[PDB]
Amino acid sequence: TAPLRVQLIAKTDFLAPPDVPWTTDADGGPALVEFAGRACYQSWSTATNAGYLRHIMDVGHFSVLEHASVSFYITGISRSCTHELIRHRHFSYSQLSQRYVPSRVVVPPGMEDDADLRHILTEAADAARATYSELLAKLEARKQARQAARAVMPNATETRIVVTGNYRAWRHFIAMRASEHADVEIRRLAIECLRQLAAVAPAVFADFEVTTLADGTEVATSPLA
Amino acid sequence: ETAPLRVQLIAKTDFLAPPDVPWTTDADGGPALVEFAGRACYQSWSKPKTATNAGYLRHIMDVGHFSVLEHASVSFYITGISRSCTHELIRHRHFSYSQLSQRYVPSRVVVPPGMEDDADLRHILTEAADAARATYSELLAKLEAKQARQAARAVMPNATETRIVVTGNYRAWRHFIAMRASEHADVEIRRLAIECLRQLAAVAPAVFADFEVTTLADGTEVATSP
Amino acid sequence: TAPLRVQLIAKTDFLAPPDVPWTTDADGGPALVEFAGRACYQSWSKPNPKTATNAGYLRHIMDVGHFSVLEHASVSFYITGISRSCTHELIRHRHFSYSQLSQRYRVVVPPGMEDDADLRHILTEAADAARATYSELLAKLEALRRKQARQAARAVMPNATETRIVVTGNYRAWRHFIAMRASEHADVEIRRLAIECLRQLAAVAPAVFADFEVTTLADGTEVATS
Amino acid sequence: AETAPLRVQLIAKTDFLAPPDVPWTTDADGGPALVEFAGRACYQSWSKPNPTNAGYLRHIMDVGHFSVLEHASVSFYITGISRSCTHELIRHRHFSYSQLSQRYVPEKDSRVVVPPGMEDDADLRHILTEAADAARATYSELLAKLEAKFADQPNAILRRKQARQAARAVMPNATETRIVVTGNYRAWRHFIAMRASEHADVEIRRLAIECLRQLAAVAPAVFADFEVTTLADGTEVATSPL
Ligand SMILES: NC(=O)c1ccc[n+]([C@@H]2O[C@H](COP(=O)([O-])OP(=O)(O)OC[C@H]3O[C@@H](n4cnc5c(N)ncnc54)[C@H](OP(=O)(O)O)[C@@H]3O)[C@@H](O)[C@H]2O)c1
Ligand SMILES: NC(=O)c1ccc[n+]([C@@H]2O[C@H](COP(=O)([O-])OP(=O)(O)OC[C@H]3O[C@@H](n4cnc5c(N)ncnc54)[C@H](OP(=O)(O)O)[C@@H]3O)[C@@H](O)[C@H]2O)c1
Ligand SMILES: NC(=O)c1ccc[n+]([C@@H]2O[C@H](COP(=O)([O-])OP(=O)(O)OC[C@H]3O[C@@H](n4cnc5c(N)ncnc54)[C@H](OP(=O)(O)O)[C@@H]3O)[C@@H](O)[C@H]2O)c1
Ligand SMILES: NC(=O)c1ccc[n+]([C@@H]2O[C@H](COP(=O)([O-])OP(=O)(O)OC[C@H]3O[C@@H](n4cnc5c(N)ncnc54)[C@H](OP(=O)(O)O)[C@@H]3O)[C@@H](O)[C@H]2O)c1
Ligand SMILES: [K+]
Ligand SMILES: [K+]
Ligand SMILES: [K+]
Ligand SMILES: [K+]
C-alpha cells in the first residue's frame, strides 16, 4: 500500500524591472501578480502586497492570478482519483506510464480504518497481477501488449503525477474538489494542495477556510469562489 | 458481458448564410461555415483557383490557416470503450467531454483489440471481471456494516466499459486523428481514431479526405496525412 | 459610419441516436445538452417529472451547477459595425474561436455620441484626415511584398475604424462573456454587443439564457445580470 | 508626440525545488531541470546508463514528448509595442496577458511606436508624429465636449470614464501599449515558430526574435533547434526543422 504524498517542486522566480518606480513587501508569485495588476493602470505610486491581492480578488480581477504557477509531484494517488484530476483544463500533467510495472495500491480513505477491508483489497490486487502475467504470456506469442494486459488492474492501482497550474487554476481546483460534493480521495488531495499553496502564497489563498466535518474529513470554502 | 466499440455521430453544424453577404458555395453545414469564416478575413465574397468549397478548404490547409477550422464542430456518443482508453482520450485539450459517472454500476467489459481473436484470453478476462465484481459486493456489504460505493469501486478493472459524449471542432479532430491513428499509438485508441475518421470523412470529405488509411500486416489500420 | 449588426450564422444540428431509448421535446443545442447530461447517468427513461421536459432538465443542470454539459452546443455570429478597440476587448476571451477582417485589407460611432451631430462630425472629419494621411504614407512607402507598405501605413488609422468578425463559442463560453461584458463595469460598446448576443442566444436557447434579465439604466443604456 | 522603442524584459521564470527523496540529480536548475524531472517521472527513470540536462531535453524533443515542456514558464514585461501589434499577439491562446488599459492616456504627450519599415525615413516618421499630435488634439476637443454634454447625467465619476472611453475613438493603431505576457515553454516555441517567420509582419517578427534571444539564454536546449538567419531586406527570421 502507498500513502498520499504531495511535494511542491516548482514555483515562480520574480525579477522586478529596475526601471519601474515600484516596490513591494513580497517576492515570487505574489509579487508578480501585484506587478501585473499595477501594469494595467501603470499605478506604481491596498498599499501592502497582501492588501493589494485582497483588493484584486474583491474587485474580481482574477486574470492577474494566471501569471504565477506552482507544480507538485504527487504519489500515492489512485488511477480513479487521477482520472478525476486530469478533467481539469488549464493544468499541465505528466503521468506515470501505464506500461510501467513495479503491486502498489492506494487504500480508499474510508477503508484505511480496517484490517479486513484492507486485506480483501490487497488480495484482490495480487489476484489481478497474477491474471496480468497469465494474459501477457498468452498474448505475446510486445510493448503495446504489456499495456493491453493491464486491462485487469484495479482502480486502486497507484499512479504518480506531475501537476502544474497557475494560481487561478489552483483556486478553481480547490473550490470544486475541496467541497462536500467531491469524493473523499480527491478532496483529501485538494486540501493538501491548498495547505502547500497557502505556505508559498498566503495572500492568494486567504479567502479559503477549512472546516473539519463531523463525518471526519475536511472541506474548504471561500466567499469569492 | 463484453461490449463492442460503437461510435455514433450525434451533432454537427447547421449553417445559415447571411442574406446580406454576396456569396454562395457548393456546400452546406460545417464545410460551408469554414469557407465563410475564411472569406470573412479578406471579404473575398465574389471569389479562380479556390472557387469551389473543397478547393477553398484544401487551400486553407495547404497554406496553414488551421484556425478557420475551429468554427465547425462534431459530437460523438461512444460506447464499448474501456475506462483506460477513455483516460488516454481525455488528455486531449480542446475537446469537451461528458462521461458515464464513476457512481454508475450496471458487469460489462471491453476486450482489448489484440485479444479479440483469442477465445482463451476472452475467457480469462471475463472471469477476472466476475471475480472483481464479487469482491466489489463483498467490500460494499462489509463497508455498510455514496462513500461506501466509492470505496468498493476500488477493485473494478481498467477494462470496465464506459460511455462518453465527445465534442470537438474540426481542428481538434484533425489533430486527434494525426496523433492517435499512428503506429506508435495504443491499439484501442487507434481503432477509435480510425472509426471517428471514417465518419468525419463521411460528413465533411473536404476537411478529412486528405487522411490515407492503410492496413498493417499485423491487421490494424493506420492513418497518415501529408 | 457603420451600425452594429450581429447575424447568427451557425448553430448545432442534433441527430438523436435511434438505439438510445430517449426522445425530447426539443432539438439542436438544447437537445444535445440534455442528451449529454443524461448520458452521465444513463437516465434515458425520464423518471423525474420536474426534469422530464427539455427546459426542466436544463434548468436543473444549471441549478445543480453542472455547467460543463453546456460545452457541447455552439453558436456562431458574424458581427459587423464593431470598432477595432471593441474587438480587441472581445478577443481577450478564450474558449472562443475567431476569424477577423485582416490587417492587410467606415467608422463606428461611440454610443454616447450617436445622437450628437456636432460630435459625430468631429469624429468623421478626424477619420477623413487619418485616411488622407494613410494614403500619403502608403504612396511614400511604396516608393508582392510591397504590402509591407499597407501594414506600415495602417499605423495612423483610428480605434473607431470598423472591423468584421466571425465569433464561435459553446453555450458555457457565451454565458461567461455575457456575465462579464453585459454588466455596468464594462464600456458601452462591448456591453451593447453582449446584450445583442444575449437577445439572439435567448431566442435559440431560452432555458439556457433565461436567468439573464435585461434592465435599463438612467442613460437609456442596458445592462444584464443573472 | 514621442516615439517608444521596443523593450522586452524577463520578469519571471520557474524556480525548481528538487524533491530530496527522489534518487536523481541534474546539472541544471530552474525550468530546464523541472522539464527533465517531469520527463523522468513518467517512467521513474531516475538512474542513468551514465556517461546531461541538455542531452535529456534533446531526447524529449526527438521522441516528440513536447507536453513535458508545459511545466516551465517565463513572463516578459513588454513596452514600446503598438496597439495593432498587441492585437496580433493576444490571438495566441495558452498565454496569459495583462495589458495597459484601453482607457489609459499618457498625461504629458502622445506616445507612438514607429513601424519598422518607417524607421529609416525622417519624412515618414514626421508625418506619423504629426498625425499622432492631431489625434491627441481631437481627443481633448471631444473629451471637453463630451463632459459638457454629460453635465446633467447621473454619476459624474461614471460620466468622466465614459467621456474618456468615447474620446479615445480617435487614437491611432501606432499608439504605444504595454503588456505582461506569460507562457510555458511549449507555448513560447509555437509563438516563435508562427511569428518569427517570413509570413509574419515585421513588428511582431521583431518581438518574437527578441523573446527567442532571451528564452535561448534561460533554456538553451529547449530553444536550440531554432536558427536565426537574416533576409536580404536586413530583417531576421527563425526556423526550426521541428
Ligand atoms: N505517460 C503518459 O501517459 C503521458 C504523460 C504526460 C503526457 N502525455 C501526453 O499528452 C498528450 C496530450 O496531447 P497533445 O498535447 O499532443 O495535444 P492536445 O492536448 O490535443 O492539444 C493540441 C495542441 O494544443 C497545444 N496545447 C494544448 N495545451 C497546451 C498548453 N497547456 N500549453 C501549450 N500548448 C498547449 C499543443 O500545440 P503546439 O505545441 O503545436 O503549439 C498541442 O499539440 C497525450 O497524447 C499524452 O500522450 C502522456
Ligand atoms: N460524471 C460526472 O460527474 C462528470 C462528467 C463530466 C464532467 N464532469 C465535471 O467536469 C468538471 C471539470 O471542471 P470545470 O470545467 O468546472 O473546470 P476546469 O476544467 O478546471 O476549467 C476551468 C474553467 O475554465 C472554463 N472552461 C474550460 N473549458 C471550457 C470550454 N471548453 N468551454 C467554455 N468554458 C471552458 C470554465 O469557466 P467559466 O464557465 O466560468 O467561464 C471552467 O469553470 C469536473 O468538475 C467534473 O466534476 C463530471
Ligand atoms: N486574418 C487574420 O488577422 C486572422 C483571423 C483569424 C485568425 N488568425 C490567426 O489565428 C492564429 C492563432 O494562432 P494558432 O491558433 O495557430 O496557435 P495558438 O493560438 O497559439 O494555439 C496553439 C495551438 O493550440 C491548438 N489550439 C488552440 N486553440 C484551439 C482550439 N480552439 N481548437 C483546436 N485547437 C486549438 C492548435 O494546435 P493543433 O492544431 O496542432 O492541434 C494551435 O496551433 C493567429 O496566429 C492568427 O494568425 C488570423
Ligand atoms: N487592462 C485590462 O482591463 C485587462 C488587461 C488584461 C486582461 N484583462 C481581462 O482578461 C479577461 C479575460 O476574461 P476571463 O479570463 O475572465 O475569461 P475567459 O478568457 O473568457 O475564460 C473563461 C474562464 O476560463 C478560465 N480560464 C481561462 N483561461 C485560463 C487560464 N489561462 N488559466 C486559468 N484559468 C483560465 C477562467 O475561469 P475560473 O477562474 O472560474 O476557473 C475564466 O473565467 C478579460 O475580461 C479582461 O477583462 C483586462
Ligand atoms: K481556471
Ligand atoms: K487542436
Ligand atoms: K468559459
Ligand atoms: K501551444
* CA pair distance B166, B171, nearest whole angstrom: 14
Chain D contact set for A17 (CB, 8 A): 9, 11, 77
Expressed in angstroms and rounded, the spacing between residue C70 Cα and the centre of ligand 2 is: 10
**Whole-number Cα distances in Å, A116 to A112, A130, A134, B128, B211:** 10, 21, 27, 21, 55
Task: Answer whether D52 contacts ligand 4 (Cβ < 6 A).
Answer: no
Per the CB < 8 Å rule, is B156 touching A152?
no
Domains, chain D, in order of start with CATH, read 1-13+73-119+172-242 (3.30.70.3180), 14-72 (6.10.140.450), 120-170 (6.10.140.440)
Give the technique used to solve this structure.
Answer: X-ray
Q: Which ligand is nearest to the CA of D39?
A: 1
Phi, psi of D80 (to 5 degrees): 65, 35
Amino acid at A221: T
Edge-first strand order for the sheet with D176-184 is A91-95, A158-166, A69-78, A5-14, D7-16, D73-82, D176-184, D95-99
| E strands in chain B | 6-15, 73-82, 95-99, 161-169, 212-215, 221-224
Q: What is the number of the ligand 2 atom nearest to the C-alpha of C67?
A: 39
Q: Identify the three-state secondary structure at position A133.
A: helix
Determine the distance in angstroms separating the CA of D11 from the nearest CA of chain A, rounded to an integer.
5
Does the annotation list B59 as a binding residue? no
| E strands in C53-147 | 74-83, 96-100
Instruction: Return the closest-CA partner of residue B51 out of B26, B19, B15.
Output: B26
Residues paired with C167 in a beta bridge? C77, C98
Phi, psi of D164 (to 5 degrees): -60, -45
* CA pair distance D144, D166, nearest whole angstrom: 11
Q: Which three cell numbers stand for residue C137?
A: 504614407
Q: Which ligand is nearest to the CA of B93?
A: 1
Q: Which three cell numbers stand for residue D38?
A: 517531469
* CA pair distance D192, D198, nearest whole angstrom: 12
* CA pair distance D111, A192, nearest whole angstrom: 49
Interface of D with C in 17-56 (CB under 8 A): none
Instruction: Return the closest-CA partner of residue C88 out of A122, D173, A178, D143.
Output: D173
Determine the distance in angstroms separating the CA of B204 from the nearest CA of chain A, rounded to an integer.
28
Query: Which ranges constitute the DSSP H helices of chain A?
Result: 28-39, 49-58, 79-85, 115-140, 143-149, 167-177, 184-200, 202-205
Q: From the CA atom positions of chain D, what is the Rg in Å?
A: 23
By DSSP bridging, strand D2-3 and strand A5-14 are: unpaired
* CA pair distance B188, B174, nearest whole angstrom: 18
Q: Are D188 and D72 in contact (CB under 8 A)?
A: no
Handedness of CA C175, C180, C181, C184 (dihedral sign): positive
Q: Are A6 and A193 in contact (CB under 8 A)?
A: yes
* CA pair distance C158, D136, nearest whole angstrom: 11
**Whole-number Cα distances in Å, B96 to B99, B178, B180, C42, D103:** 10, 19, 17, 18, 36
* CA pair distance C83, C190, nearest whole angstrom: 10
Local structure of residue A166 (DSSP, 8 states)? E
Burial class (CB in 10 A: 0-12, 13-18, 19+), D5: exposed
Residue C195 Ramachandran class (φ > 0 left, ψ -120 to 50 alpha, else beta) = alpha
Q: Which three cell numbers stand for residue A212?
A: 473539519
Q: Which three cell numbers stand for residue C31?
A: 437537445
Instruction: Return the closest-CA partner of residue D139 out of C158, C162, C134, C186.
Output: C158
Local structure of residue C224 (DSSP, 8 states)? E
Q: Chains with 3 or more CB pairs closer than 8 angstroms to C?
A: B, D
Per the CB < 8 Å rule, is B84 touching A150?
yes
List CB contacts of D56: < 8 A, sequence separation 6 or more.
Answer: D26, D36, D39, D40
By DSSP bridging, strand A209-212 and strand A218-221 are: antiparallel
Could you list the active site residues of C? Answer: 181
Q: Which three cell numbers stand for residue B169?
A: 471542432
Q: Are D79 and D171 in contact (CB under 8 A)?
A: no
Q: Whose CA is nearest to atom 41 of ligand 4?
A: A172
Chain C contact set for D172 (CB, 8 A): 130, 155-159
Instruction: Return the closest-CA partner of residue C87 out of C75, C73, C102.
Output: C102
**C-beta neighbour count of C50 within 10 angstroms:** 10
- C174 contacts chain B (CB < 8 A): no
Pairs from C20-24 (Cβ < 8 Å, separation ≥ 24): C20/B77, C20/C44, C21/C45, C22/C46, C24/C54, C24/C57
* CA pair distance A123, C167, nearest whole angstrom: 56
Length of chain D: 242
Q: How many CB pairs under 8 A join B and C?
A: 123
- B70 contacts chain C (CB < 8 A): yes
Residue in this structure with the C-alpha cell 488549464, named with its chain if needed: A90
**C-beta neighbour count of D2 within 10 angstroms:** 12
* CA pair distance B199, B196, nearest whole angstrom: 5
* CA pair distance A159, A145, nearest whole angstrom: 20
Annotated resolution, angstroms: 2.1
Instruction: Return the closest-CA partner of residue D7 out of D83, D75, D80, D74.
Output: D80
List CB contacts of C139: < 8 A, sequence separation 6 or more.
Answer: none
Q: Are D4 and D111 in contact (CB under 8 A)?
A: yes
Q: Whose CA is nearest to atom 34 of ligand 2?
A: C173
**Whole-number Cα distances in Å, C216 to C111, C177, C183, C194, C222:** 15, 19, 11, 14, 4
* CA pair distance C212, C223, nearest whole angstrom: 10
Residue D44 Ramachandran class (φ > 0 left, ψ -120 to 50 alpha, else beta) = left
Q: Are D166 and D102 in contact (CB under 8 A)?
A: no
Local structure of residue D184 (DSSP, 8 states)? E
Element (H, E) at D98: strand D95-99
- CA angle, D195 then D200 then D201, to 5°: 125
* CA pair distance D151, D160, nearest whole angstrom: 10
List CB contacts of C90: < 8 A, sequence separation 6 or more.
Answer: C82, C96, C98, C165, C167, C190, C193
